[PDB]
Design a protein around this ligand. Structure first.
Ligand SMILES: [Cl-]
Length: 201
């Protein structure tokens, strides 16, 4: 199916742009959403994690205590392989299920932190969600609880803003009034619908 890659640095806010495409009926595939789904309350994988490592892995509301799991892996790198063997098949299965269940004219792929292959290996078009560097820093602090200096270190190690803008086919600035961002999404949606029709001919 016709696929648009949604990319953006940490602190771009790109998940809110993805949500706007979802509101227009577009299937959104996001590895971070899928990874959370496979360890949701009541899941066999969450049970296995808690039975191995302890009841602190489960919050009062039944969900995974993510910090407790990161602490376990930080103290015991030898458990990474077990956790991968548990979760990887589930993530792959759910990714493929979501792809096969899609009936929309095109798909939006939310590009993860790790970019080690050309985006065009999966995608027909690349949409970058751009914000000023100061905005990236502020949004990273507020979402991850890191210091400003830590945020700067994270950003310096990602692709630069100029590199991301140059690689894009389209750019959406995730700034200003939310209604204008949504109208910009709607315009890009129309472009992608037309490109999907052209590709299908
Ligand atoms: Cl194109």
């Amino acid at each position: 199916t016709y696929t648009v890659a949604l990319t953006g640095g940490i602190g771009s806010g790109k998940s809110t742009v993805a949500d706007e495409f979802a509101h227009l009926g577009v299937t959104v595939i996001d590895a971070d959403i899928i990874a959370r789904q496979v360890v949701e309350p009541g899941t066999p994988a969450l049970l296995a994690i808690a039975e191995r490592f302890g009841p602190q892995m489960i919050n009062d509301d039944g969900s995974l205590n993510r910090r407790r799991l990161r602490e376990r892996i930080f103290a015991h790198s030898e458990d990474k392989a077990w956790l991968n063997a548990l979760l990887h098949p589930l993530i792959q299965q759910e990714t493929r299920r979501q792809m096969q269940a899609s009936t929309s004219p095109y798909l939006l792929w939310v590009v993860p932190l790790l970019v080690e292959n050309r985006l065009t290996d999966k995608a027909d078009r690349i949409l970058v969600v751009d914000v000023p560097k100061e905005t990236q820093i502020e949004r990273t602090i507020r979402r991850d609880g890191v210091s400003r200096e830590h945020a700067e270190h994270i950003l310096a190690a990602q692709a630069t803003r100029e590199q991301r803008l140059a690689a894009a086919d389209d750019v959406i600035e995730n700034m200003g009034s939310a209604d204008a961002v949504a109208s910009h999404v709607a315009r890009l949606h129309d472009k992608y619908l037309m490109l999907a029709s052209q590709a299908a001919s």
